[PDB]
Design an enzyme around this catalytic site. Sequence first.
Site, short mmCIF file in Angstrom:
data_model
loop_
_atom_site.label_atom_id
_atom_site.label_comp_id
_atom_site.label_asym_id
_atom_site.label_seq_id
_atom_site.Cartn_x
_atom_site.Cartn_y
_atom_site.Cartn_z
N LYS A 195 73.85 54.75 68.72
CA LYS A 195 73.22 54.64 70.03
C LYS A 195 71.99 53.74 70.04
CE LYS A 195 72.69 59.08 70.03
NZ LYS A 195 73.32 59.34 68.69
N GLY A 240 67.42 60.37 65.01
CA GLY A 240 67.08 59.29 64.10
C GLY A 240 67.99 58.15 64.51
N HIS A 241 67.43 57.19 65.23
CA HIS A 241 68.15 56.02 65.74
C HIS A 241 67.70 54.77 64.99
CE1 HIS A 241 68.85 58.09 69.95
NE2 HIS A 241 69.21 58.85 68.94
N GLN A 301 71.52 62.99 69.98
CA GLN A 301 72.59 63.85 69.48
C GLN A 301 73.93 63.37 70.03
OE1 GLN A 301 69.36 65.68 70.36
NE2 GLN A 301 69.28 64.72 68.34
O1 LIG Z 1 70.35 65.86 60.13
C1 LIG Z 1 69.88 64.63 60.42
O2 LIG Z 1 69.19 63.94 59.49
C2 LIG Z 1 70.12 63.99 61.79
C3 LIG Z 1 71.35 64.64 62.50
C4 LIG Z 1 71.39 64.19 63.99
C5 LIG Z 1 72.36 65.06 64.81
N1 LIG Z 1 71.86 66.44 64.89
C6 LIG Z 1 70.61 66.87 65.32
O3 LIG Z 1 69.71 66.20 65.71
N2 LIG Z 1 70.56 68.25 65.23
C7 LIG Z 1 71.73 68.74 64.75
O4 LIG Z 1 72.25 69.77 65.68
C8 LIG Z 1 72.23 71.08 65.12
C9 LIG Z 1 70.99 71.84 65.57
O5 LIG Z 1 69.82 71.33 64.97
P1 LIG Z 1 68.41 71.13 65.74
O6 LIG Z 1 68.11 72.35 66.47
O7 LIG Z 1 67.33 70.84 64.82
O8 LIG Z 1 68.57 70.02 66.72
C10 LIG Z 1 72.30 70.86 63.63
O9 LIG Z 1 73.64 70.54 63.22
C11 LIG Z 1 71.40 69.60 63.50
O10 LIG Z 1 71.78 68.90 62.31
C12 LIG Z 1 72.55 67.58 64.54
O11 LIG Z 1 73.70 67.50 64.12
N3 LIG Z 1 70.31 62.51 61.54
O12 LIG Z 1 71.68 62.24 61.12
C13 LIG Z 1 70.00 61.73 62.75
O13 LIG Z 1 69.74 60.36 62.44
N1 LIG Z 2 78.56 48.93 59.45
C1 LIG Z 2 78.03 49.21 60.63
N2 LIG Z 2 76.94 49.98 60.70
C2 LIG Z 2 76.52 50.17 61.99
C3 LIG Z 2 77.09 49.69 63.16
N3 LIG Z 2 76.36 50.11 64.27
C4 LIG Z 2 75.42 50.83 63.75
N4 LIG Z 2 75.44 50.92 62.39
C5 LIG Z 2 74.58 51.62 61.46
O1 LIG Z 2 75.00 52.98 61.56
C6 LIG Z 2 73.91 53.86 61.57
C7 LIG Z 2 74.02 54.63 62.88
O2 LIG Z 2 73.40 55.91 62.74
P1 LIG Z 2 71.97 56.16 63.43
O3 LIG Z 2 71.05 55.09 62.98
O4 LIG Z 2 71.58 57.56 63.29
O5 LIG Z 2 72.44 55.84 64.93
P2 LIG Z 2 72.07 56.57 66.30
O6 LIG Z 2 71.18 57.67 65.96
O7 LIG Z 2 73.43 57.07 66.82
O8 LIG Z 2 71.58 55.55 67.21
C8 LIG Z 2 72.68 53.00 61.44
O9 LIG Z 2 72.19 53.07 60.12
C9 LIG Z 2 73.10 51.58 61.79
O10 LIG Z 2 72.42 50.54 61.08
C10 LIG Z 2 78.27 48.87 63.06
O11 LIG Z 2 78.91 48.36 63.97
N5 LIG Z 2 78.67 48.69 61.74
MG LIG Z 3 70.78 59.43 64.22
#
Ligand SMILES: O=C(O)[C@H](CCCN1C(=O)N[C@@]2(O[C@H](COP(=O)(O)O)[C@@H](O)[C@H]2O)C1=O)N(O)CO
Ligand SMILES: Nc1nc2c(ncn2[C@@H]2O[C@H](COP(=O)(O)OP(=O)(O)O)[C@@H](O)[C@H]2O)c(=O)[nH]1
Ligand SMILES: [Mg+2]
Lengths: 431, 431
Positions: free
Chosen positions: B16, B40-41, B224
């Site tokens: 995203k 974490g984007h 999420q």
């Molecule tokens: O666990 C991490 O390091 C996150 C997961 C992001 C997605 N995600 C959340 O933000 N929360 C999650 O949703 C559920 C509830 O957690 P919380 O209440 O802290 O949001 C758990 O599965 C938790 O891992 C969940 O699945 N990173 O992948 C995001 O970049």
């Molecule tokens: N190989 C590849 N990696 C991608 C692509 N789009 C995104 N990513 C990587 O995939 C990961 C996406 O997870 P995250 O950063 O948590 O994305 P978000 O939280 O959904 O916005 C990041 O580390 C990006 O650099 C793609 O088209 N190809």
């Molecule tokens: Mg993320």
Amino acid sequence: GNNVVVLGTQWGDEGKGKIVDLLTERAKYVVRYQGGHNAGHTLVINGEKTVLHLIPSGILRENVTSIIGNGVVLSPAALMKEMKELEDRGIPVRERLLLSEACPLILDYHVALDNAREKARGAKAIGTTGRGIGPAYEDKVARRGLRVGDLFDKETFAEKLKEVMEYHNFQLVNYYKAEAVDYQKVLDDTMAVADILTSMVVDVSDLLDQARQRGDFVMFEGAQGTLLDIDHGTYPYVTSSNTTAGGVATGSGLGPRYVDYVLGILKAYSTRVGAGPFPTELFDETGEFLCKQGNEFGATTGRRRRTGWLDTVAVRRAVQLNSLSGFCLTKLDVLDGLKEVKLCVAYRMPDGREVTTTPLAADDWKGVEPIYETMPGWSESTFGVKDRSGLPQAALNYIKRIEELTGVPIDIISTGPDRTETMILRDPFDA
Amino acid sequence: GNNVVVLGTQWGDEGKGKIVDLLTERAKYVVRYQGGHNAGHTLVINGEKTVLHLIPSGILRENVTSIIGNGVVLSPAALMKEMKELEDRGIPVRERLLLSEACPLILDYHVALDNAREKARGAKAIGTTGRGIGPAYEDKVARRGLRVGDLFDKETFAEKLKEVMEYHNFQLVNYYKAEAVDYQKVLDDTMAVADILTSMVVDVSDLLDQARQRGDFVMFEGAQGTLLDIDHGTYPYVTSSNTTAGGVATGSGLGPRYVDYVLGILKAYSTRVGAGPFPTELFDETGEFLCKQGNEFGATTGRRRRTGWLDTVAVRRAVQLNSLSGFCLTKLDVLDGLKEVKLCVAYRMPDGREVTTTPLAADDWKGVEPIYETMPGWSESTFGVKDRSGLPQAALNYIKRIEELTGVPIDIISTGPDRTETMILRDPFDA
Ligand SMILES: O=C(O)[C@H](CCCN1C(=O)N[C@@]2(O[C@H](COP(=O)(O)O)[C@@H](O)[C@H]2O)C1=O)N(O)CO
Ligand SMILES: Nc1nc2c(ncn2[C@@H]2O[C@H](COP(=O)(O)OP(=O)(O)O)[C@@H](O)[C@H]2O)c(=O)[nH]1
Ligand SMILES: [Mg+2]
Ligand SMILES: O=C(O)[C@H](CCCN1C(=O)N[C@@]2(O[C@H](COP(=O)(O)O)[C@@H](O)[C@H]2O)C1=O)N(O)CO
Ligand SMILES: Nc1nc2c(ncn2[C@@H]2O[C@H](COP(=O)(O)OP(=O)(O)O)[C@@H](O)[C@H]2O)c(=O)[nH]1
Ligand SMILES: [Mg+2]
């Protein structure tokens, strides 16, 4: 539009139930998407009065299937009592009511917690309806709460309930110094109706998507009012659910892009029951008049409601939060006889500024004063009038002014409690 | 459309952030409407990697004003740390970040409660990110929580915080047998940044309504994913907020009828991090491959993510709950080299039935088995490809099949992490 939403633009009791019953003549479905049994929606057909709380207002019509969406927090005890009273009146409830397995349950400890927290608040009491609504939403968000779907496995349901109650009893007894809730009483009572609740379960989300594709007419019936919204309302003097139009989607599963027409129910004056800010609140004889002539008493708790003049500043906020398409003015007829009618058009802030937007949190309303605009009333009776022509000129100007200050058209005007005491200038379904 | 929503159709981390940064070239505003710092984007511009958590993904662009809507639960400590790290990189955060006074605050006791509840869950642990998200949403719904607006009166804020903490400490110490949270530490820390937070406050709801009227381009960035929705997700293994499109309205103040285009971010395979149902989860060598080649590790906690094949059954649910307009397929390039690619097209229920809809609550997924459809992979590299023409035929068939099984067009295809490693077949703003 096929998907119509009916909700309160003020603080509830604007007359949503009546409008729902009246408009569901052309609808296939009617959906409640938030709130619980704190709601009290009155319907009057040919003089007969029906007061619903949990069951959607389309229950009296055989052509409509009533649905309680996942956003609603369900009290198994409240439902059974409502179902019974209706079945005794010749309404085959079980034949037309469906419900979501995702609905969280309101059990005894929730009501106990509600009373306890309110007593702990003391003077700062919110003034809840004491139905356990807030606590039930907390258990949901905390992800520890039970839902209708849990009733499907009675063995594991007893395990889950045991855990949750252990948690709540500790705090009830130890922290609040109150009486513990009996696990067996709750377990027996709930299990004694589990099969009735589960037999009415349907995948609401998928169903609504099919209706959308078939072009069926669907109506969403709102509970409470916009200013009671948990996010955008006068926090903390609010209800624990989103009463604004966004709640339609989260509480039913319907994609937001499919909401076609949002009809805001607007009373000709204002009311509020419970603690909280209310700038246009009247304390004089005109206040007692509105209360008396409007019969303003809580349909759920019987509490007398606070009355005041219509507040266009607060209404303008309801216009934007809900993307209102039109209004349905109600209780115009209660304004009959009054020499003059006022309508708040701005707020004088405690610092001297004149603003036209509302503050958010309750603390920020503290010193706000309404700035009125006075208009001539009318002695002629408008009650039961079903044609604009029957409305006194002063009534029409009052109606046009509201539209002017709001920028939203009044498509329906209600002139009495009965279903037929109305005038639809425009049908949301046709629009 | 002017108002575009970008959200995850699966369980988060679909990519995203990247899409937001890429599409905000033509936007005036970018709005986060739910979640908190559990998100974490990742953004990668010319090889430089930025990982945001709370601050909207449009922060690197000078033409965009980033906004944290009321739906977001704000950690004053998380924000300051993020603001700092960005300001050190030449990003004048304070010049482009605005926020809602209605945002609830995440303080130390929230994190404490989060850890405590998770330890009490034991094996049935949800697997939260331990950032105090859930507890903060509970305090909100319980109407006892503090919001950004409270920082405005430091005297009364200390009174309010005192009360809330008294409540939480009792349960932390007495029930959970854990360590109490120091009121003065919290009071000092929070007050030590109050003026920075309050200086960024704006009436988000009114602002968004003005942008709508001016025809400004606005982007809503989701956190999420759909299946983590508090209502419609795999309860109780979900996040405490509405991750579906309805959350846009409740969390920003924007009327639902103004959502023009909902873009669903869709990864070419599946991931999930934390406990919960996951039918297409791979445990073999192909699973380790997707993880390794996809670099699947939590951007917030560093936990390795679970991988599996794309599940069109679950995706179809995301299509309806969000009224998706189109998809943005990501990580196609990770599928390079594989002999065959599968995609779940139905579920075999524990009772023998073959269904094409997903169960709701987590307990109802228990014995579900995926029913695949195998397709030929491709050895040729698709990484960085910016034209359909550069895509192997097998890739195109895989893309067309997804569209076939879904009934939603794939408007953007991502072939690498960098901003430029993309191909926009259609811009949501132009559509
Ligand atoms: O666990 C991490 O390091 C996150 C997961 C992001 C997605 N995600 C959340 O933000 N929360 C999650 O949703 C559920 C509830 O957690 P919380 O209440 O802290 O949001 C758990 O599965 C938790 O891992 C969940 O699945 N990173 O992948 C995001 O970049
Ligand atoms: N190989 C590849 N990696 C991608 C692509 N789009 C995104 N990513 C990587 O995939 C990961 C996406 O997870 P995250 O950063 O948590 O994305 P978000 O939280 O959904 O916005 C990041 O580390 C990006 O650099 C793609 O088209 N190809
Ligand atoms: Mg993320
Ligand atoms: O108090 C009654 O008898 C109700 C009031 C209906 C509107 N309304 C609610 O349903 N709840 C209210 O919102 C606030 C929170 O209460 P609760 O948590 O129980 O919903 C209180 O002000 C409570 O009165 C509130 O104002 N009837 O007027 C409804 O027919
Ligand atoms: N006089 C008058 N009463 C009305 C009108 N519309 C509704 N009512 C009454 O006003 C009350 C509305 O409050 P309530 O029943 O709580 O409505 P709801 O909960 O908003 O649907 C009911 O008792 C109705 O019978 C109207 O146009 N005129
Ligand atoms: Mg009522």
